[PDB]
Design a binder for this molecule. Sequence first.
Ligand code: AQO
Length: 167
Amino acid sequence: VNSFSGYLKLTDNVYIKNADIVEEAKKVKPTVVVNAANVYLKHGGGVAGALNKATNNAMQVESDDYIATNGPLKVGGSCVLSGHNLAKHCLHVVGPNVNKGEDIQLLKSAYENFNQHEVLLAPLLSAGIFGADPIHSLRVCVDTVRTNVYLAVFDKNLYDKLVSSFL
Ligand SMILES: Nc1nc2ccccc2c(=O)[nH]1
């Protein structure tokens, strides 16, 4: 048993809810929250901008030190950093950004990072301002992630479409 409430069960291991991931993280304080990161860990908008704002920019300060030491992530890659006031850890995962012309086949590689963690609170990778079809992102999630993932879908309208179209 875990602290996640009000989720619809899609599969053995994947759950979904219409919720703001920031407000969900603040309430649950999960072991892992996933950020929809870019390779530079520049948290300007969407999940990354909203999560970073909720940390009072401490996520960005930590991220800048990480990049200064290690250089950029790979598209499809990840790093584990602090969760600040939102979670124990933040798993920064880089899905392909369609609005930059990145290979959508890298979405499966992105979701494979989740398998290194037993339980996660996450957004749909490559959705929103990353430009991919969220229905596709949910299919790749279900077909790739084997650990227990709690998906927060910010947009009410999209949530209802994801559930009502789910195979
Ligand atoms: N507060 C906030 N929450 C989000 C959750 C998912 C995607 C985007 C966002 C966003 O842009 N702002």
